[PDB]
Ligand SMILES: *[C@@H]1O[C@H](CO)[C@@H](O[C@@H]2O[C@H](CO)[C@@H](O)[C@H](O)[C@H]2NC(C)=O)[C@H](O)[C@H]1NC(C)=O
Ligand SMILES: *[C@@H]1O[C@H](CO)[C@@H](O[C@@H]2O[C@H](CO)[C@@H](O)[C@H](O)[C@H]2NC(C)=O)[C@H](O)[C@H]1NC(C)=O
Ligand SMILES: *[C@@H]1O[C@H](CO)[C@@H](O)[C@H](O)[C@H]1NC(C)=O
């Protein structure tokens with residue numbers, strides 16, 4: 001529900017609106033079906049729709065030295 | 067017979083500011099054309115798909131703003147991070163790298179850029195898919211890659227190289243002999259650091275520097291204000307307020323007055339959507355230009371003249387801004403011009419000689435060979451020059467002497 | 479009917495001055511005026527750099543300088559003959575006007 | 577095992593033509609629609625912006 | 626309606642001209658002010674000037 005609070009409408013409040021039916025998952029993944037405001041959703045595990053903050057890629061420091 | 071060779075340089079950081087996206091507006095046209103009115107809605111259905119192709123056209127614009135923003139920023143397969151120690155040979159990126167003290171971890175110069183830029187009628191504003199905190203992880207990844215690994219993170223995985231060896235590589239790219247860096251490394255580090263200092267003075271003092279991004283935000287706000295004001299027009303109807311028509315006239319007459327309002331509001335929405343489709347092409351061509359500058363200037367070094375601001379391009383650092391990007395393009399500019407007599411070729415033992423690299427020049431009594439971009443005279447030898455043909459062919463050749471490094475080794 | 483045409487800010491004379499400046503720069507200082515100061519260079523040497531830039535050793539230019547200058551001069555004369563006789567040559571600009 | 581290497585060259589000059597600008601027209605929307613007419617202009621105002 | 630049609634066509638046409646102007650500006654910088662390594666960017670053949 002775009003641009004509404006989870007009041008008037010397994011409920012996840014995002015800045016894109018009130019998302020109902022998607023499980024909020026702490027693990028990030030590559031973006032699949034974009035929702036907005038950093039949140040994407042996908043169908044995964046038994047399977048269900050999940051919502052998560054998308055990953056921007058793996059973290060990799062460079063072994064920089066003089 | 068005269069060539070000017072500059073005996074010194076200045077390193078100039080020029081800001082280039084580019085729109086990259088615009089506000090993802092979307093309008094429930096069936097609410098804008100007919101608000102909470104069943105009688106009006108049933109009449110609007112007689113126009114078929116004139117609504118759903120406008121819901122569709124605006125959705126196409128809104129979806130591609132994240133395409134633009136992804137293509138410009140997400141040019142990196144990994145989120146690279148800077149080392150704990152800042153051992154960059156004297157260069158000082160602390161004003162363009164993240165500030166861990168902030169809630170959204172923008173750089174110092176990204177905070178200046180985020181400071182200088184400033185409904186009920188079916189209108190909405192959809193959020194971007196990349197939050198301005200995720201854009202700042204991508205520009206920090208592009209930038210921590212650029213600093214620690216040069217172009218190599220664009221070709222493969224990031225290969226570390228010391229920053230004094232990365233700039234020595236970029237000086238060879240502009241044809242300046244890389245020892246011109248090491249022999250001046252503190253001067254070059256200090257001119258980079260001082261030139262980054264001027265960026266803060268510019269962006270802090272002069273709000274008009276952001277003129278392109280504020281223009282894009284103003285055009286989108288002016289179009290929405292025009293669209294909302296156009297609800298107040300009668301278009302030939304007895305009233306612009308739909309409820310006042312319905313509360314006063316029976317259907318056989320109310321429908322006529324409503325059709326007048328429907329025609330006017332529908333044409334007035336098509337005008338907005340057509341303007342936004344043309345304005346979205348104007349931003350999409352700017353996102354593709356920003357994506358191209360990201361790929362060629364940041365992930366690389368550009369041989370294209372004036373592509374990365376005035377000067378010979380050395381490197382660029384991306385910073386984010388509200389609905390845009392900013393490139394801090396670092397360029398070598400040759401500065402202290404000097405005058406010399408010059409020769410196309412030199413004559414020695416009947417042979418003509420030409421410089422493998424550099425220009426034959428004369429301060430007025432002696433002849434030297436030297437790189438074109440930085441006065442650095444060399445005694446002329448068989449190692450700086452090659453023989454081809456003889457004296458009787460070149461126009462404007464000069465009868466100097468060319469030294470042989472082997473002779474004294476066999477003479478002694 | 480209310481239909482008018484506004485003049486351009488830069489008049490044809492001003493455009494001519496800019497192309498003149500760009501041309502004079504190109505001829506007397508090569509590319510240096512683009513990067514920074516216009517640094518005078520003997521034209522033949524400028525061409526030598528232009529040749530190295532395409533993978534042809536500079537001695538080729540000097541040894542063939544008379545040939546190259548003659549081919550260049552002839553090529554320009556051909557440009558004039560084409561533009562003076564082929565109306566369609568400027569079709570891209572005429573089409574905008576139309 | 578065969579390579580063709582040019583032994584001579586020619587300098588050619590070609591002409592590339594590009595549009596830069598278009599005529600800066602300007603239309604007075606009121607005069608166009610309701611030229612010198614008060615009665616028409618007042619009706620035109622009902623169309624707002 | 627006639628004006629709206631005209632203006633829309635001018636905006637679209639203006640975008641085409643703008644793209645051409647941008648190309649022309651790019652060439653000026655990367656063709657006149659410099660030397661192009663970009664193939665057929667500045668005519669067929671190896672660009673000199
Ligand atoms: C042009 O440069 C040469 C080399 O630097 C100058 O000749 C030398 O000048 C110095 C200082 O007077 C003497 O110590 C050397 O013995 C000279 N010979 C060499 C090394 O070439 C020359 O004087 C300069 N041009 C001028 C101003 O006449
Ligand atoms: C390269 O080609 C040019 C022609 O494009 C040759 O120059 C011509 O030589 C003939 C004699 O064989 C003369 O009659 C022409 O008038 C010359 N033309 C010009 C423009 O000079 C040139 O000799 C050739 N070079 C080589 C090495 O074969
Ligand atoms: C929803 O309402 C609560 C108050 O009950 C408020 O604290 C919260 O911030 C609101 N969320 C949104 C997205 O408006």
Ligand SMILES: *[C@@H]1O[C@H](CO)[C@@H](O)[C@H](O)[C@H]1NC(C)=O
Nearest residue numbers: 012023024025026027051052
């Ligand atoms: C994420 O982990 C925290 C514990 O660190 C937990 O409290 C929170 O409920 C988890 N959220 C989700 C969506 O699993």
Ligand SMILES: *[C@@H]1O[C@H](CO)[C@@H](O)[C@H](O)[C@H]1NC(C)=O
Nearest residue numbers: 068070071402403404405406
């Ligand atoms: C080169 O000579 C010209 C002569 O007109 C003079 O104006 C110019 O300043 C001289 N350049 C330098 C670097 O001395």
